[PDB]
Ligand binder design. Structure first.
Ligand code: NA
Ligand code: NA
Ligand code: NA
Ligand code: NA
Ligand code: NA
Ligand code: NA
Ligand code: NA
Length: 135
């Protein structure tokens, strides 16, 4: 069953987020809440996680949480706002990507996932845990 095991979702941790569309101010609100069970490094190391948060296909610069040093279970508790009228949302996709900050080399991705806005349930707050997907 090795081929089948290789196809399984790898244990790269999970991110909890929330989402709500503010119809008063016409903006998408995103909560980056916390991550859990991020993978250990070699030599028993922990990573320095942060999250990038952004819409596709939009080309504007990505939002980022603070970096949380030396933790596999960070609590971010950050909010981000996207000023996009509802009518223009559905064709877009929200991306959340967790990276390992390093000062001296490329920041390795830990993993990512995507939320197409056309299967967002508008008008109720969305909150879930999502397994980070390999990249
Ligand atoms: Na696997
Ligand atoms: Na694998
Ligand atoms: Na493999
Ligand atoms: Na994975
Ligand atoms: Na997983
Ligand atoms: Na995972
Ligand atoms: Na956590």
């Amino acid at each position: 069953g090795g081929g089948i095991l290789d196809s399984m979702v790898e244990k790269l941790g999970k991110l909890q987020y929330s989402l709500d569309y503010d119809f008063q101010n016409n903006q998408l609100l995103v909560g980056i809440i916390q991550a859990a069970e991020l993978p250990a490094l070699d030599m028993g190391g922990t990573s320095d996680p942060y999250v990038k948060v952004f819409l596709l296909p939009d080309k504007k610069k990505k939002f980022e949480t603070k970096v949380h040093r030396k933790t596999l279970n960070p609590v971010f508790n950050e909010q981000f706002t996207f000023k996009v009228p509802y009518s223009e949302l559905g064709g877009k996709t929200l991306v959340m990507a967790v990276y390992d900050f390093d000062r001296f080399s490329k920041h390795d991705i830990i993993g990512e996932f995507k939320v197409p806005m056309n299967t967002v349930d508008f008008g109720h707050v969305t909150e879930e845990w999502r397994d980070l997907q390999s990249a």
